[PDB]
Design a protein around this nucleic acid. Structure first.
Ligand SMILES: [Mg+2]
Length: 906
RNA sequence: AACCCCUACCAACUGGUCGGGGUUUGAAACCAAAGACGACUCGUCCCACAG
């Protein structure tokens, strides 16, 4: 009933406190239910709350914009089942004891929602931190993992790390530890001398004058130690605590050092000073037109900037926030001016008719017309009609008629910004634009939900408070505001302008080349050195500028270089099967000139009559035939007076399409691998939770025994022992006989007709009763269902713990994204990125565990070898560690339920 | 869309039917914010320019 305005809570003490739409400085608690009560805390009759059917439902109704639109009746009642609504994992008590400690004696269900939001934060952070760690390990080029567990962390400063001999007291006088620190310092010294640091120029380089100069080693060591500490914190589930605890990200203010704090403050101050200089200088690009279109004085309309474009916030006299705005779909009609003029229209209803004159009467304006439009748009029922409200709103804002043609310190410094937000910004310094947007949006939404729940808790009678270890979440509103601010400018410049010979060789490699390394070095030197060894004069750098503007300065190429190898990606792009699938997938978006037609016109020519399939085939032929020798022989493209301009633009478009295809492939692979990364993170988290719960599970041997330990624990009684098999069978047979004898007391009395005792429904239901008795011993609401319990017990008897451990270890290291180049050309047919990723993973596991495996797993390996496609049974056997959660097990093992965006195809 | 919980009718109940609910299940409640998703034209990669 979200469309009618129902965001009600369920359990709070012994009453049902039905909440409503928050974030409006009003309507925090609408209805309160105790027994058969219908009393309302607030006034106004937002929605009806009469008890439907008087047994297990509350009939909700509304007056306008929230009609059921047909035969429908809304009903819900939490207290009908008796006790509080237990979580399906059966760990809400442990979660409340961990995060809240002495909660409201378990008689609440908003604390568990806050804890689930925290867990979602942890999942998304672990995913993106693993991605950033893999990117740093790939760009570093070293075989040794410099970010994973075992390397340096935020415990030692740069002075102690550089000179471990004079700081022997800090390392507990351990000679092995001192030797390890010396080895790590040697690796760090080799890391600074790596010319590939320009890829992470936002974190390891500083902009000053005209070139980029590497900052001091202090900041670089601080950033690397912060990344390593994040990597240690996201893996703090197998080990309880050795040096970095689980609350490290929350106690950073007490765990980090002044050096790391100063590094984060320096980064934040640098980016904020750049933003301030930009807002002071480049304002004339828009204020010159705004002064004529909805503008009186240059100091008046400029106040909206630095808060609208650089902050994406409102912070007006009302209570609406970034999540309570209207996208407006760019008015569905240049773009920069029209977006600001329309934003300036409905913003006056929050300052001109605000509480300065509206607080005296009930409402001066039409009850906050912005919030009223939000409520009218809140009718999520039949969302295919929400776009009609934008059309009606566009016909209402026509009174503007202004779209004819179309200084002080605003942002905080590094001191009044949380270390959490500064570390999130430093982490986004290692991610792409899409990844940054997704991560920051998820974090903003989760923190906003957390702060809303924390504001609702005291009014519904919940006095739960966070422990000292998790008291960081008390500032969730400030955290969300800082994250919104950071997201507003976290995508301003990925690469640097100081590209080197290494980057030139990488650009030549990704464009296709078979020359030796010495020949590549010579060709890269020819970009800046003449035929006599001197640097080229000004104006003779045409080829180098072209390569820069086409390859190195491309965000897609940056994403490709962070997660992949240029030669490997070039070998990937030579396969016509996958390229035709990617190009064919772009042609399917035309249902929403065409993109394929534009690509064919800009890359191949203005030929007509060619069908879509022929255009895709031609684009595949010109993309698979990509080679740098095409641009080398035509190096005369440096002339840009107008003759070779057509060929230059054609080459630009071809390179753009090539990089776009490879970027799509790699991004899909990474997004699919991140799902199983999050899955194994959840497996480890729930393992630790069930260990803290009081059950029998070995967190030390969950690696050797396979990650299916949680699945075996939640399945119930373990029957994986030959001596215990007969005992368990006899006990379950006795239980089934007792249940059959005791069933004859109710509507299942009809069992007296389905009995023949030879092989009929009698013995059939006897076996099914044995199965459900085995199922009732489960420890969670998922595996308590007899169907899923039987499926899990069948999957457990044929499990391969070594194969599961290998799959878990390879899912975190992105070995699929590493070895895709070696197994992409061994596929019979590519149907989707899901099947591609899983075939590559199974091929890697086979290459590692073919001669060592046996039993049914060898049959699945042989089937994969013969059929040249992924095996669904082998996949669902690898998802057994996910067996404790049935939705996750079904989403990560079934292709039709994996992707939510591709659900329309299935 | 998978899963879970519901009043009415059947149904070992590991089946279903009209409908509702789930931020307390899965990337995963409303509005927004991302993503699938590549573009179009006007402050982001236009070269009047930049090693
Ligand atoms: Mg959730």
């Amino acid at each position: 009933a979200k469309g009618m305005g129902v965001k009600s809570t369920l359990v709070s003490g012994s009453k049902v406190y039905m909440t409503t739409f928050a974030e409006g400085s009003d309507a925090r608690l609408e209805k309160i239910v105790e027994g058969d009560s219908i009393r309302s805390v607030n006034e106004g009759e937002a929605f009806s709350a009469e008890m439907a059917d008087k047994n297990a439902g509350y009939k909700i109704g509304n007056a306008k914009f929230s009609h059921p639109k047909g035969y429908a009746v809304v009903a819900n009642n939490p207290l009908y089942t008796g006790p509080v609504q237990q979580d399906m994992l059966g760990l809400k008590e442990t979660l409340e004891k961990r995060y809240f400690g002495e909660s409201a004696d378990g008689n609440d269900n908003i604390c568990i929602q806050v804890i689930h939001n925290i867990l979602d934060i942890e999942k998304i952070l672990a995913e993106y931190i693993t991605n950033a760690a893999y990117a740093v390990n790939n760009i570093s080029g070293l075989d040794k993992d410099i970010i994973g567990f075992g390397k340096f962390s935020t415990v030692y400063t740069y002075d102690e790390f550089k000179d471990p001999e004079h700081h022997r007291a800090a390392f507990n006088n351990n000679d092995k530890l001192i030797n390890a620190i010396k080895a790590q310092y040697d690796e760090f010294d080799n890391f600074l001398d790596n010319p590939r640091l320009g890829y992470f120029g936002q974190a390891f380089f500083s902009k000053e004058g005209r070139n980029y100069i590497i900052n001091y080693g202090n900041e670089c060591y601080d950033i690397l130690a912060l990344l390593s500490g994040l990597a240690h914190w996201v893996v703090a589930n197998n080990e309880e605590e050795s040096r970095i605890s689980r609350t490290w990200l929350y106690n950073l203010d007490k765990n980090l050092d002044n050096e790391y704090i100063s590094t984060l403050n320096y980064l934040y101050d640098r980016i904020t000073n750049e933003l301030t200089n930009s807002f002071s200088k480049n304002s004339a690009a828009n204020v010159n037109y705004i002064a004529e279109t909805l503008g009186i004085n240059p100091a008046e309309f400029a106040e909206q900037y630095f808060r609208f474009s650089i902050m994406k916030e409102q912070k007006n006299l009302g209570f609406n926030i970034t999540k309570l705005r209207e996208v407006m779909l760019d008015r569905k009609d240049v773009y920069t001016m029209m977006d600001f003029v329309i934003y300036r229209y409905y913003i006056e209803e929050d300052a001109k008719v605000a509480a300065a004159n509206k607080s005296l009467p009930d409402n001066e304006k039409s009850l906050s017309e912005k919030d009223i439009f939000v409520i009218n748009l809140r009718g999520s029922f039949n969302d295919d009609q929400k776009d009609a409200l934008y059309y009606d709103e566009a016909n209402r804002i026509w009174r503007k008629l202004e779209n004819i043609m179309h200084l002080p310190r605003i942002l905080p410094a590094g001191r009044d910004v949380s270390a959490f937000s500064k570390l999130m910004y430093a982490l986004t310094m290692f991610l792409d634009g899409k990844e940054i947007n997704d991560l920051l949006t998820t974090l903003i939404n989760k923190f906003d939900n957390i702060q809303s729940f924390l504001k609702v808790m005291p009014l519904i009678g919940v006095n739960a408070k966070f422990v000292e270890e998790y008291a960081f979440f008390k500032d969730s509103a400030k955290i969300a505001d800082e994250l919104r601010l950071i997201k507003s400018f976290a995508r301003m410049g990925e690469p640097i302008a100081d590209a080197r010979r290494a980057m030139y060789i990488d650009a030549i490699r990704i464009l296709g080349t078979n020359l030796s390394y010495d020949e590549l070095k010579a060709l890269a030197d020819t970009f800046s050195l003449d035929e006599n060894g001197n640097k080229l004069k000004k104006g003779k750098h045409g080829m180098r500028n072209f390569i820069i503007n086409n390859v190195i300065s491309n965000k897609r190429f940056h994403y490709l270089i962070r997660y992949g190898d240029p030669a490997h990606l070039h070998e990937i792009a030579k396969n016509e099967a996958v390229v035709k699938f990617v190009l064919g997938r772009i042609a399917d978006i035309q249902k929403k000139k065409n993109q394929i037609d534009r690509y064919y016109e800009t890359c191949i020519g203005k030929d007509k009559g060619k069908s879509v399939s022929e255009k895709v085939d031609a684009l595949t032929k010109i993309i698979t035939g990509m080679n740098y020798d095409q641009f080398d022989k035509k190096r005369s493209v440096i002339e840009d007076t107008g003759r070779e301009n057509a060929e230059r633009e054609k080459f630009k478009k071809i390179i753009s399409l090539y990089l776009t295809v490879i970027y799509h492939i790699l991004k899909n692979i990474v997004n699919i691998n991140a799902r199983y990364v999050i899955g194994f993170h959840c497996v480890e988290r729930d393992a630790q939770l069930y260990k803290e719960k009081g059950y029998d599970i070995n967190l030390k041997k969950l690696e050797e025994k396979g990650f299916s330990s949680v699945t075996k624990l939640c399945a119930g009684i373990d029957e994986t022992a030959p001596d215990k098999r007969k005992d368990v069978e006899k006990e379950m047979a006795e239980r089934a006989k007792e249940s059959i004898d005791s069933l004859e007391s109710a509507n299942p009395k009809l069992y007296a007709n389905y009995i023949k005792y030879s092989d009929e429904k009698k013995a059939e239901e006897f076996t099914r009763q044995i199965n459900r008795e085995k199922a009732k011993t489960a420890l969670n609401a998922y595996l308590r269902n007899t169907k899923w319990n039987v499926i899990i017990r069948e999957d457990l008897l044929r499990i391969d713990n070594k194969t599961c451990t290998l799959f878990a270890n390879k899912a975190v290291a992105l070995e699929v994204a590493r070895y895709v180049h070696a197994y992409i050309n061994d596929i019979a047919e590519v149907n989707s990125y899901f099947q591609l990723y899983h075939y590559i993973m199974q091929r890697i596991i086979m290459n590692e565990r073919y001669e060592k495996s046996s039993g049914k797993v060898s049959e699945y390996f042989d089937a994969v070898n013969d059929e040249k496609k992924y095996n669904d049974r082998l996949l669902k056997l690898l998802c057994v560690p996910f067996g404790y959660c049935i939705p996750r097990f079904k989403n990560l093992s079934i292709e039709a339920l994996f992707d939510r965006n591709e659900a329309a195809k299935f």
